[PDB]
Scaffold this motif. Structure first.
Motif, PDB file in Angstrom:
ATOM      1  N   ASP B  48       0.859  -1.175   0.000  1.00  0.00           N
ATOM      2  CA  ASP B  48       0.000   0.000   0.000  1.00  0.00           C
ATOM      3  C   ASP B  48       0.901   1.233   0.000  1.00  0.00           C
ATOM      4  OD1 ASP B  48      -2.225   1.727   0.244  1.00  0.00           O
ATOM      5  OD2 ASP B  48      -3.390   0.181   1.244  1.00  0.00           O
ATOM      6  N   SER B  53      -2.188   2.146   6.273  1.00  0.00           N
ATOM      7  CA  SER B  53      -3.007   1.436   5.288  1.00  0.00           C
ATOM      8  C   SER B  53      -2.558  -0.015   5.140  1.00  0.00           C
ATOM      9  CB  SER B  53      -2.941   2.141   3.926  1.00  0.00           C
ATOM     10  OG  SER B  53      -3.475   3.450   3.995  1.00  0.00           O
ATOM     11  N   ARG B  83       0.315  10.623   8.196  1.00  0.00           N
ATOM     12  CA  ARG B  83       0.311   9.627   7.126  1.00  0.00           C
ATOM     13  C   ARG B  83       1.356   9.969   6.076  1.00  0.00           C
ATOM     14  NH1 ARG B  83      -3.662   5.888   5.730  1.00  0.00           N
ATOM     15  NH2 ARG B  83      -5.311   7.140   6.736  1.00  0.00           N
TER      16      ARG B  83
ATOM     17  N   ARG C  38      -6.141   9.185   2.456  1.00  0.00           N
ATOM     18  CA  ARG C  38      -6.012   7.939   1.715  1.00  0.00           C
ATOM     19  C   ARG C  38      -7.334   7.480   1.107  1.00  0.00           C
ATOM     20  NH1 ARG C  38      -6.304   4.232  -0.713  1.00  0.00           N
ATOM     21  NH2 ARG C  38      -5.211   2.221  -0.859  1.00  0.00           N
TER      22      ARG C  38
END
Lengths: 107, 135, 130
Positions: B48, B53, B83, C38
């Motif tokens: 990913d 994730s 992230r 995301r």
């Protein structure tokens, strides 16, 4: 302050390489924290060492051509020139006392 | 250039707490690969764009396993910045009605035994409830 | 109008000075970027105006050494101003960069070891200074 030479790529050979007496050149950029940190320290040194040393500044953002010629890959970098040649190099931030130590040991 | 990090975690499987090894392979262009091992046997792998994730994909493949990690806790989630900048390794432990603070930051593979027996979907749904609780 | 922002990363400056910072996907929705960048993959790169907020991310929570990158751009969106009181992590002082950051716009890199101490000099991007 009023004693600091404000260099450009065009003026470098004249004001540094052909200068009389020792020249301290500060390679610097406005976006660099360590560069701005040593800035007023160099103003102090420029007055205290007047008649023994000239302090000059080269802003690498407005003058991108000079630093590569001296292998300068980081800032702040201080180059001490004597009669057209690099006599000493100091890379990175330092205090007023650390700077005076570097100068007294090279003048 | 490819980076490889490793990390030991605890997992629960058949009521048996056991130690697992994680390999984190960070390759160019935001490709993150998460492998998990037990006693040199690869249990699963996920690929990913960040490790939070990856971890969620990993727990979805192994639904019979409780992962005793911050990254599996129902109220842990990365910010956009965490992230993006830490490849999802750093995340926040959130509380309803309160914005996420620096002191709430956690490593997604640090140990945690509370509120971790939940699916990635339940975690993701709590995060939407948290986000909407800030108004 | 140009601003200086910062970004942490464990990735080396050789790789970053060449490839810039790319985004995950085409979604130009800033509110959804803040909720979860995301899902959908957002078209923004996160940076901060507070260099100290990069350290934790650059070191992956004190586990690794890394770098703080310095950038100059003029298209960023102030996330706290855009989300107001809904801003989920307002202490990050985030500037989201639509479309990414070109390699050319990354001015330099400063090393940070795992305990959060940064080097006292900035390495220059040769794309701009070499």
């Amino acid at each position: 302050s009023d004693k600091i030479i404000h260099l450009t790529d065009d003026s470098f050979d004249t004001d540094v390489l052909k200068a009389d007496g020792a020249i301290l050149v500060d390679f610097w950029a406005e976006w660099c924290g360590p560069c701005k940190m040593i800035a007023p320290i160099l103003d102090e040194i420029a007055d205290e060492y007047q008649g023994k040393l000239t302090v000059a500044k080269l802003n690498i953002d407005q003058n991108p051509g000079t630093a590569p010629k001296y292998g300068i890959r980081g800032i702040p970098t201080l180059l001490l020139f004597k009669n057209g040649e690099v006599a000493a190099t100091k890379v990175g931030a330092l205090s007023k006392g650390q700077l005076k130590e570097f100068l007294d040991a090279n003048l | 250039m490819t980076d490889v990090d490793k990390r030991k975690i605890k997992i629960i499987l058949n009521g048996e707490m056991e130690e697992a090894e994680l390999h984190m392979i960070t390759s160019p262009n935001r490709h993150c690969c998460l492998k998990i091992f037990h006693n040199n046997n690869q249990l699963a792998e996920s690929n990913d764009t960040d490790y939070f994730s990856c971890f969620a994909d990993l727990r979805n493949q192994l639904k019979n396993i409780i992962f005793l990690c911050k990254g599996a806790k129902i109220n842990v989630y990365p910010s956009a910045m965490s992230r993006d900048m830490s490849d999802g390794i750093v995340a926040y432990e959130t509380t309803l009605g309160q914005p996420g603070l620096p002191e709430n930051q956690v490593h997604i593979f640090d140990f945690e035994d509370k509120y971790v027996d939940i699916t990635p979907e339940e975690q993701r749904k709590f995060h939407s409830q948290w986000f909407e609780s800030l108004v | 109008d140009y601003i200086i922002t910062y970004r942490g990363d464990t990735r080396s400056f050789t790789e970053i000075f060449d490839k810039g910072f790319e985004t995950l996907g085409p979604s130009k929705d800033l509110y959804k970027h803040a909720l979860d960048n995301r899902a959908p993959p957002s078209d923004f790169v996160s940076t901060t105006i507070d260099p100290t907020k990069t350290i934790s991310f650059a070191t992956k929570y004190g586990q690794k050494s890394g770098y703080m990158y310095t950038m100059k751009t003029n298209h960023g969106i102030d996330v706290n101003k855009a989300l107001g009181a809904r801003s989920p992590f307002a202490a990050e002082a985030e500037i989201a960069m639509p479309g990414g950051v070109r390699a050319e716009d990354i001015l330099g890199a400063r090393a940070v070891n795992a305990d959060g101490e940064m080097w006292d000099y900035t390495i220059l991007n040769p794309k701009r200074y070499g």
